[PDB]
Amino acid sequence: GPDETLSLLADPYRFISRQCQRLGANAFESRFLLKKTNCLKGAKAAEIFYDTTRFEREGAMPVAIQKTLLGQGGVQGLDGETHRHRKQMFMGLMTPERVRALAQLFEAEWRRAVPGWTRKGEIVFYDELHEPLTRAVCAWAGVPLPDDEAGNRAGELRALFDAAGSASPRHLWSRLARRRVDAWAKRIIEGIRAGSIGSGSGTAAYAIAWHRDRHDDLLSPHVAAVELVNVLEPTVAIAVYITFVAHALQTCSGIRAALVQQPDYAELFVQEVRRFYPFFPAVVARASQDFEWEGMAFPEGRQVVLDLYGSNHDAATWADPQEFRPERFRAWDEDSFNFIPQGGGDHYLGHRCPGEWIVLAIMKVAAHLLVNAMRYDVPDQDLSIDFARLPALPKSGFVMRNVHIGG
């Protein structure tokens, strides 16, 4: 076939569902870089994608992504019992009490950043989110963060995912940021192991520093560093969803009123933000053995891409996926395959994001503050979603003016 890399890069979120619409199917054979790729979309496709007897991640991860977005040696590259034992380390972090502690730290950091925002008079809301998230998640994770370094660390953490998917010299910064952040986290792990850093027994950094693998060995300091960044970086990336929260409040009538007066609405709202808005485009795996599925060949070694955005906008699952309607979540059956903004399947037995509880609790804090606490004006701007950007954002970055707080 022809190489469709540039077409994908031009339309990362929609490329797959669009061709699926053109072809009248939930899957199509394509080619990105050198490799023939099966592209899949929808609930049934996701379910076979998460079948670990048919798919592996080891031979999947494009090694320019490990130099920016993910690091080398982390949980995303693992399969089988090695993966499950590493994944359990992340899952133990996510108790309701610890998730709530992080949400509270973030609300306090949001409230502390507001006087700064007022004094600026006008802010790019997205730009302003990285630092309070960095301060909160570092504190929560037992990562010391001096006051005068937070701004810089936040910038480096942001560069890992926002300068990563960037067809620009911004890629060089992303790579330097990765080496800097990995070296920084490694010094954190080393200090914890030597006893010069007193991170608490319940914190991410402690758990990761002291984790023993299936051979009863500590992770090498660099692998532990990568796994710690796998907590810090994606927590900072919640800036994107918080920006989408403000965007929904501004562009969809009735949403604000419902949030203020209906206590159960907020949970429905944050879920619909995750379903509706583009964030993580697609996940990649490799077929581990020859099989056939719905007339399509999956030879051993075939790269397979599961389209998350398309699956989240699948009309067989949702009725009117194109509409933004939190109420749709009253009727959701909690299926692990038909709603997949951060992966599908089981958290313990597959690669599904262990960050979902944190994302939900932090988006709830955001929605609460933006309706019950924050006061702000929204000038004329281009709020349209930039579907060509990774991550996608309102083109303006959501601009606020005259910002102040209450309690």
Which residue intervals of 195-237 are DSSP H helices? 204-210, 221-236
The reply on whether position 76 binds ligand HEM by CB under 6 A is: yes
Residues 212-231 that bind ligand HEM (CB under 6 A): 230-231
The one-character DSSP state at 149 is G
Q: How far apart are CA 7 and CA 324, in angstroms?
A: 27
CB 71 within 8 A of CB 230: yes
Residue/partner pairs of 1-4 with CB below 8 Å, 24 or more apart: 1/29, 1/30, 1/31, 1/36, 2/31, 3/31, 3/32, 3/33, 4/30, 4/31, 4/32
The encoded tokens of residue 310 equal 């398309």
Amino acid letter, 142: G
From the annotation, which residues make up the binding site for heme b? 50, 57, 83, 87, 280, 342, 351, 353
The reply on whether position 357 binds ligand HEM by CB under 6 A is: no
Taking the least distance from each CB to ligand HEM, the nearer of 177 and 304 is 304
Q: Which helix (H) or strand (E) holds 39?
A: strand 35-41
Residues 278-307 that bind ligand HEM (CB under 6 A): 279-280, 283
The reply on whether position 90 binds ligand HEM by CB under 6 A is: yes
Taking the least distance from each CB to ligand HEM, the nearer of 304 and 403 is 304
The one-character DSSP state at 59 is T
Taking the least distance from each CB to ligand HEM, the nearer of 186 and 352 is 352
> For residue 334, is it left (φ>0), alpha (ψ between -120 and 50) or beta?
left
Site string for ligand HEM, 25-54 (x = CB under 6 A): ------------------------------
The reply on whether position 310 binds ligand HEM by CB under 6 A is: no
Site string for ligand HEM, 244-283 (x = CB under 6 A): -----------------------------------xx--x
Taking the least distance from each CB to ligand HEM, the nearer of 30 and 76 is 76
The reply on whether position 126 binds ligand HEM by CB under 6 A is: no
The window from 23-31, 117-125, 317-325, 348-356 that contacts ligand HEM (CB under 6 A) reads 348-356
The reply on whether position 15 binds ligand HEM by CB under 6 A is: no
Q: What is the largest CA-CA distance in the chain?
A: 62
CB of 49 to ligand HEM, least distance (A): 8
Taking the least distance from each CB to ligand HEM, the nearer of 266 and 283 is 283
The reply on whether position 154 binds ligand HEM by CB under 6 A is: no
CB of 253 to ligand HEM, least distance (A): 26
Q: Which helix (H) or strand (E) holds 16?
A: helix 15-23
Q: How far apart are CA 238 and CA 135, in angstroms?
A: 13
Q: Which helix (H) or strand (E) holds 338?
A: none
From the annotation, which residues make up the binding site for heme? 353
CB of 372 to ligand HEM, least distance (A): 23
Given candidates 37, 134, 174, 235, which one binds ligand HEM under the rule CB under 6 A?
235
The candidate with the shortest Cα–Cα distance to 232, out of 176, 197, 274, 186, is: 186
Q: How far apart are CA 406 and CA 372, in angstroms?
A: 8
The window from 116-124, 243-251, 253-261, 353-361 that contacts ligand HEM (CB under 6 A) reads 353-361
The reply on whether position 73 binds ligand HEM by CB under 6 A is: no
Taking the least distance from each CB to ligand HEM, the nearer of 103 and 403 is 103
- Nearest-CB residue to ligand HEM? 355
The candidate with the shortest Cα–Cα distance to 102, out of 359, 348, 347, 352, is: 359
Given candidates 69, 141, 359, 390, which one binds ligand HEM under the rule CB under 6 A?
359
Q: How far apart are CA 257 and CA 249, in angstroms?
A: 9
